[PDB]
Amino acid sequence: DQTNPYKLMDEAAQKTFDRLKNEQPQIRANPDYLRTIVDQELLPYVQVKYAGALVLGQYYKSATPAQREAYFAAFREYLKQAYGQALAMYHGQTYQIAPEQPLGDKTIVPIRVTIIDPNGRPPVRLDFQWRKNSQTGNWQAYDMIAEGVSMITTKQNEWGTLLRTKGIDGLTAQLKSISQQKITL
Ligand SMILES: [Br-]
Ligand SMILES: [Br-]
Ligand SMILES: [Br-]
Ligand SMILES: [Br-]
Ligand SMILES: [Br-]
Ligand SMILES: [Br-]
């Protein structure tokens, strides 16, 4: 049900976390496989262009069609790497998802997923950020903030300077560069 981000979050967590739980041998043999799991289970619920547009800010409008295309393709690769690296710590832990609350007229909704430690250590909080398309009523995720670390605003200052000194092509090259870093465990 696309008009309720709590239902979508539940389903997306179920698919993503079950696959990370059940394919640990493959992940241990090649941690970059995490990109594939992220790509296939989680990114269908993520509005990749919306997230990319937030990072790009004022530089979007003046960018050329080719520059835009290259930027968005690099950004999507970066998201696979980032979500992959952030979820590498998940290997089958129990998790709890914040319960459904009134949506009212809201168009942005954060939803906390808590990863429970099996030994009673403190939990790890993943705050997924959901946005509504007000024309269609449908929701998609655009960020996941992992104990305060955002996939898109954490590097805002460095990416701001890079855009200002080298434009969108500078940032695209940097996103590509980051996406080629080996995921580690
Ligand atoms: Br335009
Ligand atoms: Br690329
Ligand atoms: Br565990
Ligand atoms: Br559960
Ligand atoms: Br502890
Ligand atoms: Br839509």
UniProtKB/Swiss-Prot annotation:
Keyword Transmembrane carried by entry: no
GO cellular component: outer membrane-bounded periplasmic space
Keyword terms, alphabetized: Periplasm, Signal
Gene3D superfamilies: Tgt2/MlaC (3.10.450.710)
Record's subcellular location: Periplasm
Coarse class of the protein's main subcellular location: periplasm
Deletion phenotype: Mutation leads to accumulation of phospholipid in the outer leaflet of the outer membrane and increased outer membrane permeability. It confers sensitivity to SDS-EDTA.
Residue pairs linked by disulfide bridges in the UniProt entry: none
Superkingdom assignment: Bacteria
UniProt entry tagged with the keyword Signal: yes
Complex formation: Interacts with the MlaA-OmpF outer membrane complex and with the inner membrane ABC transporter complex MlaFEDB, via direct interaction with MlaD.
PANTHER family: INTERMEMBRANE PHOSPHOLIPID TRANSPORT SYSTEM BINDING PROTEIN MLAC (PTHR36573:SF1)
Family according to the record: Belongs to the MlaC/ttg2D family.
Described function: Involved in a phospholipid transport pathway that maintains lipid asymmetry in the outer membrane by retrograde trafficking of phospholipids from the outer membrane to the inner membrane. May transfer phospholipid across the periplasmic space and deliver it to the MlaFEDB complex at the inner membrane.
Record's protein name: Intermembrane phospholipid transport system binding protein MlaC
Organism of derivation: Escherichia coli (strain K12)
Gene encoding the protein: mlaC
